[PDB]
């Protein structure tokens, strides 16, 4: 049974994958959703908000549920490595 | 009760927005997501596959069901528009 706040859990490991793969920054990722979607929080500083050891957790059972590929937790969640990669696209 | 499918419906109409904002074009977004996501059909040609029709009859479905912003649908869909918006970041 899915929560609307799931929705958001995979829009991050999206985010976070782009990111993860190089095709993106953190930033231009928050920004682009916090202006184009008005809202208060991009992908990220949600996932810092939630944490990256929650979001996986959750994410793993969507894994179980449904066994698509966009279920799966980023590897930067699943080993709470999150922070040291907004270094990445932030940092240089 | 929510599909797997459900979950690029919301993605998709996530990207069509952005592009409605000016933040991203309908390309920087596919590319990404094809070659950051390696899948085959980035949330443009996916939608194009799928049809706006389809999508937001749908994503009507979802905004009823849990009253979000994230699942209404977007304008350009829900008004099959979609054509001449790829038009817009991909014209010009």
Wanted: proline share 5%.
């Amino acid at each position: 049974k899915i929560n609307p706040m799931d929705f958001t859990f995979v829009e991050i490991n999206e985010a976070v994958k782009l990111v993860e793969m190089g095709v993106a920054t953190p930033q231009d990722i928050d920004t682009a959703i916090k202006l184009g979607l008005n809202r208060p929080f991009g992908p990220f500083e949600l996932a810092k908000q939630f944490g990256a050891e929650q979001i996986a957790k959750r994410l793993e059972e969507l894994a179980k549920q449904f066994g698509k590929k966009i279920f799966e937790p980023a590897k930067t969640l699943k080993e709470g490595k999150l922070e040291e990669l907004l270094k990445a696209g932030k940092a240089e």
